[PDB]
Amino acid sequence: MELYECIQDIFGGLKNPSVKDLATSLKQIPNAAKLSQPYIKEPDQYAYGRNAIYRNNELEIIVINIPPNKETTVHDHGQSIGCAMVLEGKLLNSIYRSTGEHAELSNSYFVHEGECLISTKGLIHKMSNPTSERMVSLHVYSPPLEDMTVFEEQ
Ligand SMILES: [Fe+3]
């Protein structure tokens, strides 16, 4: 089938989904990697490619492409929860706690192809790509991202 057809089918009816619902939804996309290929974008504003392909008043779906040894900022997602499924490659997700105006590294783990990473509310994190290949992921945020807070390291 086709990605937007799949997205309307799976995500279009969700109302106040949990991070659990979002993860479950992402795993329901058949051939997510194949389907997402025409939406993968190269870095423009960011160190990583980022393409927002769907949005209603509940959620927002974004295609992310982190090149080798690139990373995001250390950030939270405002008032939003987030889930991400790795389409291709492997990312390291690092977790932080607020040490005041700043943030200290608290946890880190890998997410491999087909696996999901979760971002509960207020969660501070950074995705990076320590590997020699790109990493492509499919992200969902709910509500759609408004104000991202970026933190400075310890
Ligand atoms: Fe994030």
From Swiss-Prot:
The keyword Cell inner membrane does not apply. It catalyses: L-cysteine + O2 = 3-sulfino-L-alanine + H(+). Belongs to the cysteine dioxygenase family. It comes from the Bacteria. Its EC number is 1.13.11.20. The gene is cdoA. This is Cysteine dioxygenase. GO terms for molecular function: cysteine dioxygenase activity; ferrous iron binding; oxidoreductase activity, acting on single donors with incorporation of molecular oxygen, incorporation of two atoms of oxygen.
